[PDB]
Amino acid sequence: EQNCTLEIESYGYTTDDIEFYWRGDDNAVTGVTKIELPQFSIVDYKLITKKVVFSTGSYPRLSLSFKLKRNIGYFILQTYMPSILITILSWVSFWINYDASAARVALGITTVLTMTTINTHLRETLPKIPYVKAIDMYLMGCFVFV
């Protein structure tokens, strides 16, 4: 979940020269429920009014905050199901009787190939967050299992 804010302040006028408030204080912000985000969902929003104290004085401030919860269906179907299915295909090597070495080698190493291809395509398509994430951990788990 992401807590995305929008901060509204006065540049030069201080609290003893200007005051901010929400007109209604519960119904000042409208249209949040009608928003349709393809990838997220507005679970909650809040309105805050305060006075931030800076060195030279107190300045009025309003804050509009949203809590975005990212949908999971797309990620499941496009990243997690394929990984698990390739993992099962990797497991199929056990039922194949040992004496067939070409078949077991082909199955195992081609499952490794497919796992790598899926991982690289997910690199390519997904947003480029260059630090470690939960999805990265899951794909490493799957690749380790293969």
């Binding site: 409208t30 179907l77 394929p82 295909l89 009787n97 078949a103 081609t110 899926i118």
Partner: protein, 333 residues
């Protein structure tokens, strides 16, 4: 000669801050459009471009003159000196007029005070596509516009007989959709400021499947029918059947990528994505079926003998049943 005097008189004792008949009655504005084009509809951002000629006609009794000339036909030069309605497009992510070589406005003032004001706009309207039945989906995306500051009791919009009219409809930059028709509408919306007359021009579009057929449906279908070959391959060709199955899996994943590559990250099962998932499940099932057959060989060869003959007819018939149900259900919407 005389026209300069007419204009100087017209703008003498004028006040462009006040709408015509500020305190008497609402100003009635007749609006026309001429859609030069409807550009791409990129489902990723849920927006569609549109290039139009927006014309508004109203009545201003301050701009009434008497003279042998029945109409004054001016440039954009005067547009900034007389009152112009603050019409704006309520569903535009980013719109802009055109300014080359000279502002693309147009002003015309008649004897009786009728003003006609035309400009050329390119509007990136927003419409939230409901991406079910992809790629067999049909949408109706609006271009809405209303005054920004004048409520219902100050400015009222009103369509005409031939208000909105399309052009060739062949030079349009529509790629995957196809133009089918349009409708004009008028409503009154409630806003924080007041009640605003909102005018709408719905444009109806239908996606065209000539691309997704060749891209996904045909290759996925052929890959499945190719994976079936393992059944007819003898049961002793163990490495051959294993490689066949797994290579078909790899190809199917390659295809499943390009499947979704086109669409935004909608978190629901679209139709084409359901199709590709089902094809991948069929390939998965074929490979695991061969695996189970191979495992049963060493234990019960008689039991394994009938499994191949069962699968040979159960897989094709199952796929045909799925295809019939699918293509019938998604085209009945």
């Amino acid at each position: 000669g005389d026209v300069t005097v007419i204009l100087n008189n017209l703008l003498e004792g004028y006040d462009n801050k006040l709408r015509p008949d500020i305190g008497v009655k609402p100003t009635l504005i007749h609006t026309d459009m001429y859609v030069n084009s409807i550009g791409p509809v990129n489902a990723i951002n849920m927006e569609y471009t549109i290039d139009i000629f927006f014309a508004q006609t109203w009545y201003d009794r301050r701009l009434k003159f008497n003279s042998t000339i029945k109409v004054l036909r001016l440039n954009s030069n005067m547009v900034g000196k007389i009152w112009i309605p603050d019409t704006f497009f309520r569903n535009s992510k980013k719109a802009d007029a055109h300014w080359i070589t000279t502002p693309n406005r147009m002003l015309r003032i008649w004897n009786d005070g009728r003003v006609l004001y035309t400009l050329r706009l390119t509007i990136d309207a927003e419409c939230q596509l409901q991406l079910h039945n992809f790629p067999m989906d049909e949408h109706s995306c609006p271009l809405e516009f209303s005054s920004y500051g004048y409520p219902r009791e100050e400015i009222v919009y009103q369509w005409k007989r031939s208000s909105v009219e399309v052009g060739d409809t062949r030079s349009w930059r529509l790629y995957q959709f196809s133009f089918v028709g349009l409708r004009n509408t008028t409503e009154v919306v409630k806003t924080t400021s007041g009640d605003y007359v909102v005018m709408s021009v719905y444009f109806d579009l239908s996606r065209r499947m000539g691309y997704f057929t060749i891209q996904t449906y045909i290759p996925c279908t052929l890959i499945v029918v190719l994976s079936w070959v393992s059944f007819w391959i003898n049961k002793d060709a163990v490495p051959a059947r294993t490689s066949l199955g797994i290579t078909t899996v790899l190809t199917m994943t390659t295809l499943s990528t390009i499947a979704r590559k086109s669409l935004p990250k909608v978190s629901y099962v679209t139709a084409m994505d359901l199709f590709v998932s089902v094809c991948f499940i069929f390939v998965f099932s074929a490979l695991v079926e061969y695996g189970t057959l191979h495992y049963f060989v060493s234990s019960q060869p008689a039991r394994a003998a009938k499994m191949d003959s069962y699968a040979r007819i159960f897989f094709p018939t199952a796929f045909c049943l799925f295809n019939l149900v699918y293509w019938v259900s998604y085209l009945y919407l």
